[PDB]
Design a protein around this motif. Structure first.
Motif, PDB file in Angstrom:
ATOM      1  N   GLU A  78     -10.207 -24.172 -34.276  1.00  0.00           N
ATOM      2  CA  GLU A  78      -8.642 -24.475 -34.057  1.00  0.00           C
ATOM      3  C   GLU A  78      -8.541 -23.363 -33.424  1.00  0.00           C
ATOM      4  N   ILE A  79      -9.436 -22.187 -32.863  1.00  0.00           N
ATOM      5  CA  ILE A  79      -9.089 -20.988 -31.739  1.00  0.00           C
ATOM      6  C   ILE A  79      -8.806 -22.104 -30.874  1.00  0.00           C
TER       7      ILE A  79
ATOM      8  N   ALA B 201      -2.349 -16.712 -35.367  1.00  0.00           N
ATOM      9  CA  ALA B 201      -4.291 -15.805 -36.118  1.00  0.00           C
ATOM     10  C   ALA B 201      -5.445 -16.432 -34.456  1.00  0.00           C
ATOM     11  N   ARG B 202      -4.939 -17.957 -35.125  1.00  0.00           N
ATOM     12  CA  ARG B 202      -5.960 -18.911 -34.391  1.00  0.00           C
ATOM     13  C   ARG B 202      -5.620 -18.940 -32.744  1.00  0.00           C
ATOM     14  N   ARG B 203      -4.311 -18.937 -32.734  1.00  0.00           N
ATOM     15  CA  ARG B 203      -3.724 -18.775 -30.692  1.00  0.00           C
ATOM     16  C   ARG B 203      -4.561 -17.631 -30.801  1.00  0.00           C
ATOM     17  N   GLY B 204      -3.807 -15.999 -31.462  1.00  0.00           N
ATOM     18  CA  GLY B 204      -4.338 -15.522 -30.849  1.00  0.00           C
ATOM     19  C   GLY B 204      -6.230 -14.662 -31.083  1.00  0.00           C
ATOM     20  N   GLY B 205      -7.153 -15.745 -30.988  1.00  0.00           N
ATOM     21  CA  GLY B 205      -8.646 -15.842 -30.996  1.00  0.00           C
ATOM     22  C   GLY B 205      -9.276 -15.345 -31.615  1.00  0.00           C
ATOM     23  N   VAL B 206      -8.812 -15.220 -33.203  1.00  0.00           N
ATOM     24  CA  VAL B 206      -9.301 -14.818 -33.763  1.00  0.00           C
ATOM     25  C   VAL B 206      -9.870 -15.469 -35.419  1.00  0.00           C
ATOM     26  N   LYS B 207     -11.505 -14.644 -35.304  1.00  0.00           N
ATOM     27  CA  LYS B 207     -12.452 -15.974 -36.064  1.00  0.00           C
ATOM     28  C   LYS B 207     -12.485 -16.499 -37.572  1.00  0.00           C
TER      29      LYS B 207
ATOM     30  N   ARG C 140      -2.018 -19.989 -38.127  1.00  0.00           N
ATOM     31  CA  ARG C 140      -2.436 -20.494 -36.991  1.00  0.00           C
ATOM     32  C   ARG C 140      -2.234 -19.766 -35.744  1.00  0.00           C
TER      33      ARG C 140
ATOM     34  N   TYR D  55      -5.140 -24.258 -30.652  1.00  0.00           N
ATOM     35  CA  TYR D  55      -4.049 -23.569 -31.122  1.00  0.00           C
ATOM     36  C   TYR D  55      -4.159 -22.796 -28.947  1.00  0.00           C
TER      37      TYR D  55
ATOM     38  N   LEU E 174     -13.178 -21.974 -34.516  1.00  0.00           N
ATOM     39  CA  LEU E 174     -13.565 -21.400 -33.840  1.00  0.00           C
ATOM     40  C   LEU E 174     -12.837 -23.061 -33.078  1.00  0.00           C
TER      41      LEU E 174
END
Lengths: 79, 96, 283, 91, 68, 77, 92
Positions: free
Chosen positions: B13-14, F14-20, F12, B17, B11
């Motif tokens: 990291e979300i 995927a994280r910017r895409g909101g993936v947990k 990274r 980024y 979370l």
DNA sequence: TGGCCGTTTTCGTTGTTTTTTTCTGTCTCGTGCCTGGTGTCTTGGGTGTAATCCCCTTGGCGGTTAAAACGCGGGGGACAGCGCGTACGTGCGTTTAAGCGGTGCTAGAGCTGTCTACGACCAATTGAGCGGCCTCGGCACCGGGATTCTGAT
């Protein structure tokens, strides 16, 4: 209230052609809303073309142009 | 010794980024990939610097968006973990 | 009088559109009626067809003493009811003080130069003082409590709220006889709210509608329309019937000048601002 | 030479935010934007004229194209500005 | 369907007429659209290990399509 | 060279895409997807390059390819 | 009242590929829609190509590049073959 | 041995495919005309080609540091199994309005004629806009204290 003319069995038939085997009771109203929005959008543009041409009759071409500019090109209704 | 529970750092990291805009793939391997792929279409090609940067911005934007849709598909199936089938559903519905 | 927008619902406008008009701030058939189509269309959830149905069915349905003798003489006896009178002057010239005084003098008997009506104070600058109203009331021998009872008060937080209170004022001014409507720092919210430069036409439109409502209320209720303007406008000139220039004389005594009036000469009269009152100058 | 909308974008920026500047990348994005919308509107106007067997693109075609391409309030305000500008220009 | 089309069109411009083929064009477009939507919806239902399509399936399909 | 698009990079993205949370099989899948995308765009870009009788792919070549694939890019004109 | 269409040419092609096969009016309408659609796509892309390269002329080169951009794979290769053959035969 | 539980058969049912006969309207062909396409000639300007220059792409070296790769423990999430209850599929009787066919009229699409306003075009002018140069302030990088937030207690 003509959207109700899009009946439950009609929506079922459309879903069947779409490969759907089982249908929640809430689908039908949902479908109507979706259909209405779609129709509104197409017809709006169509009528716009009609109005630009200073006509009082919506033509097949008006609809075809509306659909084309909405990325839903339709074949069979030119000429 | 301290250890964060599974998910907390994810979370973090979300948020990190999604807050920033920097490119997330390394420059040189991406460039290498681009030249490799390009070679199978046309011989003797060169590239403007900004052309490779353009391709990278486009690619990363595409992947991030695809991961958004993929995530929606995973959540739809009552999961929190994205899987290949999520990507495949997203790409099928996109018309890819 | 008013035609509350409720009656529009029996013409066959759906009730949701009437709720949208009230959310926009239209509460009478009068409100929908004297507006062009575009006003109703810009409201969320209103099409051009509903606006045409509303306008068609709506067309089917549709001297107060200042208490300063010198100022009364300058005005030939006091404000003419049924018209807007603008007093533009520097800050602290007594616009707010004159408003507080008039909020009570309006309630004075007509034989005393009043209008025998209640007052309305719409504040935008925080300067509303019930104690000043009490002081003016006891000065002229009016019930200070009744002045606050003859003053319905609400602070307008923005230009939209400033105009919206007139709709509440319009419906409220029907239930009781009023003689005075006060809008204090009327132009301040159009500068503080609309502070950008591209939004100037927007504040001008909102102000125009606000002024039309003020004139409408004046002609409807025979009340005096008083607005105070800070000069850190010529649009008010055509709307305002009498322009008074106010400047301070030292102590609590103020100089009043007429700087435009199509009927009154450019002339001056001296008055003072006293704890009790806005009251004649006593050098 | 090589044209862009940069100076005009900057003038507008100075109109809406007098003390605000803009980066080179952001200006590039604004230029991309203006060219994009130009192409969309001009293209639709071109088709409008063709469909109706007219050889001239007029402000009416521009206006209709704007109504087709822009959503809701953006469309209404854009139509208002175009009309106002043409009216100020004509006299 | 014709009544639907005319009602909706009339709320944009009154007293409009329609070529017959215009209404038929609109119907072909609408039914093709709904059938495709039901295909995607069905895929979403199956993805969630259901065999019954539900409103959330429609909403997911349309969200991913970029319609919502 | 596709393996140069590493696991942490994809993470990274995927994280910017909101993936947990992310399955181990995602990475290879992502690579395939990326390759296809790149291929298509580049195929068009080079076509433009060849029409202009150039040997250098320009930013504009890429922009036109992207545009004609309905993936308009701002910032490189 | 004179209305032009691609019907007779579509029909000639049909007789080339399936000598004993006919076609309904509706189907012919879909074919006409098809030809006009592809015409628009190719001509438009060619126009854009000529513009990008500061050329005032659309030549067979622009047509060919447009064909390569618009058509998938082998379809593109086959179409290019037909166009090229036609232009070289015409030139002679 | 006798009695159960499971499977496969069949007969009754029944939708659907198949195969033949009548009809019917829509498609495949003819023919007259007219207008759009082909041959021929012209100018002119756009594109092809050749030389030039310079910039910007490619290639190499080195360091250095942050990111990638790898190992490992564990926890939490995917996934399989199970129970239940309820919502949906199926069938049937009723009712409702869609469809089809005829008729009638008028609004409005579509075509033609005329003419005038309006936009292409062209030459002279010039000032707005672009390239280049310079500078300073917004922002970025660094570092250190404050605040937030998370997880174990």
């Amino acid at each position: 209230d003509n959207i109700q003319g899009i009946t439950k069995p009609a929506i079922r038939r459309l879903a069947r052609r779409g490969g759907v085997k089982r249908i929640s009771g809430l689908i039908y109203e949902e479908t109507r809303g979706v259909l209405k929005v779609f129709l509104e959008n197409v017809i709006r543009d169509a009528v716009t073309y009609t109005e630009h041409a200073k006509r009082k009759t919506v033509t097949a071409m008006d609809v075809v142009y509306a659909l084309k500019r909405q990325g839903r090109t339709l074949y069979g209704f030119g000429g | 010794p301290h250890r964060y529970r599974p998910g907390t750092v994810a979370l973090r990291e979300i948020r990190r980024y999604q807050k920033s805009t920097e490119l997330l793939i390394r420059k040189l391997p991406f460039q290498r990939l681009v030249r490799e792929i390009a070679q199978d279409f046309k011989t003797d090609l060169r590239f403007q610097s900004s052309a490779v940067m353009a391709l990278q911005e486009a690619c990363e934007a595409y992947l991030v968006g695809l991961f958004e849709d993929t995530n929606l598909c995973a959540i739809h199936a009552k999961r929190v973990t994205i899987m290949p089938k999520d990507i495949q559903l997203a790409r099928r519905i996109r018309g890819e | 009088g008013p035609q509350p927008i409720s009656r529009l619902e029996q013409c066959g406008i759906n009730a949701n559109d009437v709720k949208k008009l009230e959310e926009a701030g239209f509460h009478t058939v009068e409100a929908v009626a004297y507006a062009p189509k575009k006003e109703l269309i810009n409201i969320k959830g209103i099409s051009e067809a509903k606006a045409d149905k509303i306008l068609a069915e709506a067309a089917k349905l549709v001297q107060i003493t200042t208490g300063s003798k010198e100022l009364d003489k300058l005005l030939q006896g006091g404000i003419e009811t049924g018209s807007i009178t603008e007093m533009f002057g520097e800050f602290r010239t007594g616009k707010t003080q004159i408003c507080h005084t008039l909020a009570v003098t309006c309630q004075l008997p007509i034989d005393r130069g009043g209008g025998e009506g209640k007052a309305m104070y719409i504040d935008t600058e925080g300067t509303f003082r019930p104690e000043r109203l009490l002081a003016v009331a006891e000065r002229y021998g009016l019930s200070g409590s009744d002045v606050l009872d003859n003053v319905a008060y609400a602070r307008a937080f923005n230009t939209d709220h400033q105009t919206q209170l007139l709709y509440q004022a319009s419906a409220m001014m029907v239930e009781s006889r009023y003689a005075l409507l006060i809008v204090d720092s009327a132009t301040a919210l159009y500068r503080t709210d609309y502070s950008g430069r591209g939004e100037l036409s927007a504040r001008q439109m909102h102000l125009a509608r606000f002024l039309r409502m003020l004139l409408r209320l004046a002609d409807e209720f025979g009340v005096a329309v008083v607005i105070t303007n800070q000069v850190v406008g010529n649009i008010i000139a055509h709307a305002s019937t009498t322009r008074l220039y106010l400047r301070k004389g030292r102590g609590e005594t103020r100089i009043c000048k007429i700087y435009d009036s199509p009927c009154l000469p450019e002339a001056e009269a001296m008055f003072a601002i006293n704890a009790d009152g806005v009251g004649d100058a006593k050098d | 030479r090589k044209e862009s909308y940069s100076i005009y974008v900057y003038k507008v920026l100075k109109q809406v935010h007098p003390d605000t500047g803009i980066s080179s990348k952001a200006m590039g994005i604004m230029n991309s934007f203006v060219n994009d919308i130009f192409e969309r509107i001009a293209g639709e106007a071109s088709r409008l004229a063709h469909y109706n067997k007219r050889s001239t693109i007029t402000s009416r075609e521009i206006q209709t194209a704007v109504r087709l391409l822009l959503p809701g309030e953006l469309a209404k305000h854009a139509v208002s500005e175009g009309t106002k500008a043409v009216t100020k220009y004509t006299s | 369907f014709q009544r639907l089309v005319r009602e909706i069109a009339q709320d944009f411009k009154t007293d409009l007429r329609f070529q017959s083929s215009a209404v038929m064009a609109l119907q072909e477009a609408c039914e093709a659209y709904l059938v495709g939507l039901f295909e995607d919806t069905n895929l979403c239902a199956i993805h969630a290990k259901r065999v019954t399509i539900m409103p959330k399936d429609i909403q997911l399909a349309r969200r991913i399509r970029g319609e919502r």
